[PDB]
UniProtKB/Swiss-Prot annotation:
EC number(s) per entry: 3.4.23.22
Any coiled-coil regions, as ranges: none
The Peptidase A1 domain, residue ranges: 17-328
Protein name as catalogued: Endothiapepsin
Annotated disulfide bonds: C255-C290
Record keywords: Aspartyl protease, Disulfide bond, Hydrolase, Protease, Signal, Zymogen
Catalytic activity annotation: Hydrolysis of proteins with specificity similar to that of pepsin A, prefers hydrophobic residues at P1 and P1', but does not cleave 14-Ala-|-Leu-15 in the B chain of insulin or Z-Glu-Tyr. Clots milk
Length: 330
């Protein structure tokens, strides 16, 4: 089998991407944030505290003839940005782009933190990291990809995120029309549960490539590109007036600037992020200070190849027995 679904930016900045997902019988369609950095499929639901729902579409398990309470199971998750959610668990039929999994753990939120409530466009998350990170207790549950893998034509999914435009998540096949050149594959460590790999270096604008190993994660659920402070300082030094602002929480730059590109290495290959992809707009409405899309990872503990990086490439998440990652230009 295969599946193919369009993923759409939630706003004019590409702050995140939502993909429609069918849950239950008859189908209830929710727009979920596909997140290769976590491993829980959780949804706003009829069980979510009413004051914490503000415009999201909710899953109502009592209206699904295939929903079954997973007795005794609870979940609770905290994300790198400080947000969180928790609740109980059903199993139900879940379909993405024509690909159907029966018995998928659908984690029903009883509580969500303010940033989820405040984002009316995201109805939940669909985790695509390794199932070892799944938070369901006492019986850890499998991701949608893990449950579908054996049925897929090939044990892969691909992320093709657009810049200010829709893109595609495919399951079970590699669309050879969706990229240019060849796909360069690189080793993955699953030791932390992530799609963790080592970039071979970077360049700023037309500058020379610096060969240096940068361990990080391919994370569709993170907006920006988070790299070591040395790398980030080298980038922003090429933008007149750019500075790190503790009060804003990162590098800002004059909105009048033209940003240089940023290149990252995948083996001997190179992925070029155009400068425009690094512009996240005014820090507040009407400000002439703009927020940068490349930020320091120094406070995180891990480097994160988030959407800013991934949207510049066609990315293969290869879930074969030894997983690997593939990157192509497009």
């Amino acid at each position: 089998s295969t599946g193919s679904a369009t993923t759409t930016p939630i706003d004019s900045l590409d702050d995140a991407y939502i993909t429609p997902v069918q849950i239950g019988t008859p189908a209830q369609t929710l727009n979920l944030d596909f997140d290769t950095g976590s491993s829980d499929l959780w949804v706003f639901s009829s069980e979510t505290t009413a004051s914490e729902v503000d415009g999201q579409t909710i899953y109502t398990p009592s209206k699904s003839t295939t929903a079954k309470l997973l007795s005794g199971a609870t979940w609770s998750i905290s994300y790198g940005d400080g947000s969180s959610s928790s609740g109980d668990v059903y199993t139900d039929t879940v379909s993405v782009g024509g690909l159907t999994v029966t018995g998928q753990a659908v984690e029903s939120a009883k509580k969500v933190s303010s940033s989820f409530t405040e984002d009316s466009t995201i109805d939940g998350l669909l985790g695509l990291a390794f199932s070892t990170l799944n938070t369901v207790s006492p019986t850890q549950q499998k991701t949608f990809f893990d449950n579908a893998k054996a049925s897929l034509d090939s044990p892969v999914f691909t992320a093709d995120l657009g810049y200010h435009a829709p893109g595609t998540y495919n399951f079970g096949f590699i669309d050879t029309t969706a990229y240019t050149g060849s796909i360069t594959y690189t080793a993955v460590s699953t030791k932390q549960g992530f799609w963790e790999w080592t970039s071979t270096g970077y360049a700023v604008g037309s500058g020379t490539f610096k060969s240096t190993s940068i361990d990080g994660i391919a994370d569709t659920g993170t907006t920006l590109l988070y790299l070591p402070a040395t790398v980030v300082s080298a980038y922003w030094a090429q933008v007149s007036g750019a500075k790190s602002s503790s009060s804003v929480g990162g590098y800002v730059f004059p909105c009048s600037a033209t940003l240089p590109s940023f290149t990252f290495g995948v083996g001997s290959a190179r992925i070029v992020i155009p400068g425009d992809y690094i512009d996240f707009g005014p820090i507040s409405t009407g400000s002439s200070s703009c927020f940068g899309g490349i930020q320091s990872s120094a406070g995180i503990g891990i480097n994160i190849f988030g959407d800013v990086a991934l949207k510049a490439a066609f990315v293969v998440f290869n879930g074969a027995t030894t997983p690997t990652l593939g990157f192509a230009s497009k």
